[PDB]
Amino acid sequence: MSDLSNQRKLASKVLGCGLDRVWLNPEASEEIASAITREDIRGLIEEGTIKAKPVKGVSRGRARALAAKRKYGHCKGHGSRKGKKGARTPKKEQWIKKIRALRRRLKELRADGALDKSVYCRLYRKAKGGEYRSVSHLNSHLESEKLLKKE
Amino acid sequence: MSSINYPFVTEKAMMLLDENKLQFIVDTRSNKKQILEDVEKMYGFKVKSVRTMTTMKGMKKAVLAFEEPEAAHEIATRIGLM
Amino acid sequence: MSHNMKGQKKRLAKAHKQNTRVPVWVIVKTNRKVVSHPRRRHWRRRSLDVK
Amino acid sequence: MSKGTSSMGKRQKRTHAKCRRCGSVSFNVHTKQCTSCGFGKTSRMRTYKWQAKCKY
RNA sequence: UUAUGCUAUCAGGUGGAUGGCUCGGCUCAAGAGCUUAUGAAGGACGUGCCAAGCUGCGAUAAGCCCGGGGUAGGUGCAUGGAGCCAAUGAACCCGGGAUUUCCGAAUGGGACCUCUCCGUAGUGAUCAUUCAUGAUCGGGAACGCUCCGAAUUGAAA
RNA sequence: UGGAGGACCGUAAACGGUAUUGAUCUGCAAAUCAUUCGUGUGACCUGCGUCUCGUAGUGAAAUGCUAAUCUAACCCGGCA
RNA sequence: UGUUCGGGUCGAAGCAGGGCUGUGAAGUCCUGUGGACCGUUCACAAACGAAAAUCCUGGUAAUAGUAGCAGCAAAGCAGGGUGAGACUCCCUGCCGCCGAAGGGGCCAGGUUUCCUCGGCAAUGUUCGUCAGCCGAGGGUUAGUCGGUCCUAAGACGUACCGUAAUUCGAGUACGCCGAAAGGGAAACAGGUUAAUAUUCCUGUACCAUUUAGCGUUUAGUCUGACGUCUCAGGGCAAGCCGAGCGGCGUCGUCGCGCCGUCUAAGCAGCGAACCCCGUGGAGAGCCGUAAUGGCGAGAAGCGGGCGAAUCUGUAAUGGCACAAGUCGGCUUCACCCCGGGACCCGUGAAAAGGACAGCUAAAUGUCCGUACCGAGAACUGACACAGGUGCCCCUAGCUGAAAAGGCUAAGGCGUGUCGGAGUAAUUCAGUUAAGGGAAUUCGGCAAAUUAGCUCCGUAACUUCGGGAUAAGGAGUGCCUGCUGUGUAGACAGCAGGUCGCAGUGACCAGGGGGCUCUAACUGUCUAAUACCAACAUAGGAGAUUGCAAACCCGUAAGGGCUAG
RNA sequence: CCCUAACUGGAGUCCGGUGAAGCUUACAUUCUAGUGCACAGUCUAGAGACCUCUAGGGGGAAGUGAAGACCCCGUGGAGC
Ligand SMILES: [K+]
Ligand SMILES: [K+]
Ligand SMILES: [K+]
Ligand SMILES: [K+]
Ligand SMILES: [Mg+2]
Ligand SMILES: [Mg+2]
Ligand SMILES: [Mg+2]
Ligand SMILES: [Mg+2]
Ligand SMILES: [Mg+2]
Ligand SMILES: [Mg+2]
Ligand SMILES: [Mg+2]
Ligand SMILES: [Mg+2]
Ligand SMILES: [Mg+2]
Ligand SMILES: [Mg+2]
Ligand SMILES: [Mg+2]
Ligand SMILES: [Mg+2]
Ligand SMILES: [Mg+2]
Ligand SMILES: [Mg+2]
Ligand SMILES: [Mg+2]
Ligand SMILES: [Zn+2]
């Protein structure tokens, strides 16, 4: 065989792959060397003489096992943390989720008749003032102070 | 002043005859309207469209699509290409 | 992909077709007295003063 | 950045174009004048006595 | 057969001196002496069967037409192939015509675009006349006229 | 809670150019390379365009820079 | 040169060597070589004599088969081909390089380097059958992509005026140009070539003008049309997970891993926020936001209008091994839509064009560019140059805060174009080093130490801002099971078990403190020996000037400061 | 640093290929002293020395690079 380089370049264009993805049959070299046109390369491709080798991806299974453990709360301790507290949990997002949960809880309590407008206004301002850690804390304050219009 | 110099007869230019197109070397000073009128007066076939390009030899090549089927073959036979 | 006008590309085309060897028959006709000309060049050298 | 070869990599443009009138690449693209023949400045051809020596 | 070397000559290589030759140069003399809007000089691009440069020519493109001289060959620098032209007098020279792209005084407008825009198809600017028409513009080796106008240098500063 | 600043750290993003007085020093290079460093939301960096120049310009000013040329650039001429 | 007398193809000049004469400058002769010219008397001329000028031009040595072909990316090996010839060209496998750049796209620039065939004298730092080299031939197709159109800073032209004069000069008036990254009429997917492809072909669209018919202003508004910082909401390319299906890999055991499971514009439909309109009447206060906020000058609540990205359908038959082609979920940058806030002694372009009255048909849509590189070989620096242009704009998985670094995809490469050999000194760059620990040195230069994150704790001094990561301490891996916050992605925390010398195990990653001088600080600088205490700076002070000003440019016409 | 050692990769060393440049009036295997423009491989008198090649660090060749930039001089300049 002389250079099969023209055929390899044409076959990578026809197959839509990279140049080294192209596999030329080391036994059918003279058959490949007679292929000049895109039609000849297409014939060799259809008859299996020229093919595109499989892409060797990056397997992600062991990342899957690690991700499952991290979902469970493991493999995530202080010796694994590298970013600042704030790059791992931004503070504005924490506040946003907290205040939105508290406000939605208060809105539903006022809607379903458990909370009149006078105490709803004060509770809303208290939530805006960081008086409650979460929805559970707010509910506990409601039940301890008996602010819910129980019936 | 004819804008048409002669048919371009290369492998790619001869591949046009099987799609009823014909490629000419034309005067580079002329445009598509002049090329169309010159070809229609030169061979008496209606031209559907003109495609033109300038080359690195300083020439202008025009590809002419014809309306009547077989017109490219008839002109190529009249010239002597086929 | 610099953008040339018609005349700039025409001058480039003339420069390109000037960069050809003297014909062999000219060398035969002149008895090896004309074997080259001053417009020979290479594209990767001191550029054209044309465009 | 050195005044030598490093600054010479920024030479991707031109100060003079080809002149319509004389063909010399001397047409200043900013002043719109040919520094060789004077095209774009005068209807005459740029000539000076100091372009040669005093003929004596 | 003493190597590595040294000195002289010879043969060869390299090299391109010397000699001889020269269609080139230089100087002097005698002549002759303007050209361009009827678009010049100059430039760009094209133009040859094989053609890249130069030269010539301009899409009629190393050329076309007419008259005279010349007469048997011709097809530029530049005897290669193949053809073509020429006794219907070519080539060549003298005279007169035609063709003569784009830029260029460049002048319908615009040019880091030798092209591009409008196409109402183009008298651009400044002028003379009755307002038919006409003039000027760019180029030319030096010479000529008008006006503006240094310094080195010498005086041993 | 908020998100200011010629704020902080930091990238072989970009810009700069400390020290090695390292490599190199007929070099990869007529100023580069490695490591180490300074700035990195701002008087920030940068592309393209455009303007300002020779007794002039430009300069957060070193006589720095104005095409490897700067206490007056370069070309030709005065000039043998 | 004039003039006298000659020689030469039976061999002139010149050249190499030699004989003789002459003190010598030199002359003559001989042999060889050479192939056409050369002398001589008496005189006359001169561009008339070279060993030297770091002389000039050319040629050519020693150096020397020497330096270099190493340092910034140490890359090749086996087998098989081709060929006269193979480390170096081709294929397969193995082993490697880059992998937020060495990949992808493209500006300027280059200008044919693109593709095919044929070559190997030169070029290529070696070779070469290879090649960006050499020769021959071929290759660039547009109404929709750009230019073209618009205007910007700012040029240019004509006129006027100045000037001894002009090709010179400011201003004005009128024009005209000035952006391939600003504004902007419109096209997509697939296929086709060796090389072109939103350009050719198939399919399905769209825009502009002219014409003809059908109808006509709302007209002057809006749009084009805009800064920096910050944040919410919605969407989405990319990314990730589970199931089915179809391939490939693995298969010592296991059943995993990878790839695919597609789908454009156009057309039609819905519409979040903002804004507006109608009701409503809210305070010993209510309603909101991530935050700022809103409210009888009319809140909440309730209806309506206007109005996005995108999504849904259609295009649905195209491409796919006519192999599957069917589904869900999560997230979403660095992209799109939308809205809020903050800042300014800083206020962030213009014009063309477009919309507001158009519908139907036919015709027209010229011109230029289009190949390829876009850089550790296509540009520029004389080079196939470790620089610069450009890191300009983009980029997959794991780790991780991350685009850092490391390891891998895809893609690109083994050409940051010499090889072999393995053996001295020396040398460039690294690893380690007993005991001592700055004794070295001008000087801790160089190197070493520390290093992430969490928690505890943090001095003098201070302009009250800071110093500050001060200092100084503790923890950190893996496994098993969980708790809390949150709509979610995730984040935080706990209990127990357990291995090692060592758990930020590699990678990455401050050493710290005390006392002085000096400049307040961020900033600027001797491109190529000076990054400083020099320059600048805010602050402080002084001076001139009321504008036909002060100050400054011009010969003038007239200008800068000054749209002050 | 005392006081260096071992090891790693690249050069070097040896082999194949490719392939420059810079010093040079000549000669030249030197060493000592003297002499000499008082700083000699070459002069003078001695002493040495068989030649060629390889590797090696740089004693000498007042080694090479550059018509000294320090000083003076020039009825030489330039800027201030
Ligand atoms: K004097
Ligand atoms: K003087
Ligand atoms: K392309
Ligand atoms: K003060
Ligand atoms: Mg300079
Ligand atoms: Mg004169
Ligand atoms: Mg005249
Ligand atoms: Mg004097
Ligand atoms: Mg920093
Ligand atoms: Mg002079
Ligand atoms: Mg001589
Ligand atoms: Mg890697
Ligand atoms: Mg070679
Ligand atoms: Mg076109
Ligand atoms: Mg324009
Ligand atoms: Mg080696
Ligand atoms: Mg300072
Ligand atoms: Mg100061
Ligand atoms: Mg004196
Ligand atoms: Zn000119």
UniProtKB/Swiss-Prot annotation, chain B:
The keyword NAD does not apply. Keywords: Ribonucleoprotein, Ribosomal protein, RNA-binding, rRNA-binding. GO terms for cellular component: ribonucleoprotein complex; ribosome. It holds the Pfam family Ribosomal_L23. GO terms for molecular function: rRNA binding; structural constituent of ribosome. InterPro entries: Nucleotide-bd_a/b_plait_sf, Ribosomal_uL23, Ribosomal_uL23-like, Ribosomal_uL23/eL15/eS24_sf. GO terms for biological process: translation. Gene3D superfamilies: 3.30.70.330. Binds to 23S rRNA. One of the proteins that surrounds the polypeptide exit tunnel on the outside of the ribosome. Part of the 50S ribosomal subunit. Contacts protein L29. Belongs to the universal ribosomal protein uL23 family. HAMAP family: Ribosomal_uL23_A. This is Large ribosomal subunit protein uL23. The lineage of its organism: Archaea, Methanobacteriati, Methanobacteriota, Stenosarchaea group, Methanomicrobia. The gene is rpl23.
Curated annotation (Swiss-Prot), chain C:
GO terms for molecular function: structural constituent of ribosome. GO terms for biological process: translation. Transmembrane segments: none annotated. It holds the Pfam family Ribosomal_L39. InterPro entries: Ribosomal_eL39, Ribosomal_eL39_CS, Ribosomal_eL39_dom_sf. GO terms for cellular component: cytosolic large ribosomal subunit. It comes from the Archaea. Keywords: Ribonucleoprotein, Ribosomal protein. Belongs to the eukaryotic ribosomal protein eL39 family. NCBIfam families: PRK01242.1 (NF002316). This is Large ribosomal subunit protein eL39. It comes from Methanosarcina acetivorans (strain ATCC 35395 / DSM 2834 / JCM 12185 / C2A). The lineage of its organism: Archaea, Methanobacteriati, Methanobacteriota, Stenosarchaea group, Methanomicrobia.
Curated annotation (Swiss-Prot), chain D:
Pfam families: Ribosomal_L37e. Its cofactor is Zn(2+). GO terms for cellular component: ribonucleoprotein complex; ribosome. The keyword Transferase does not apply. Binds 1 zinc ion per subunit. One of its GO terms (molecular function) is rRNA binding. HAMAP family: Ribosomal_eL37 (MF_00547). This is Large ribosomal subunit protein eL37. It comes from Methanosarcina acetivorans (strain ATCC 35395 / DSM 2834 / JCM 12185 / C2A). The gene is rpl37e.
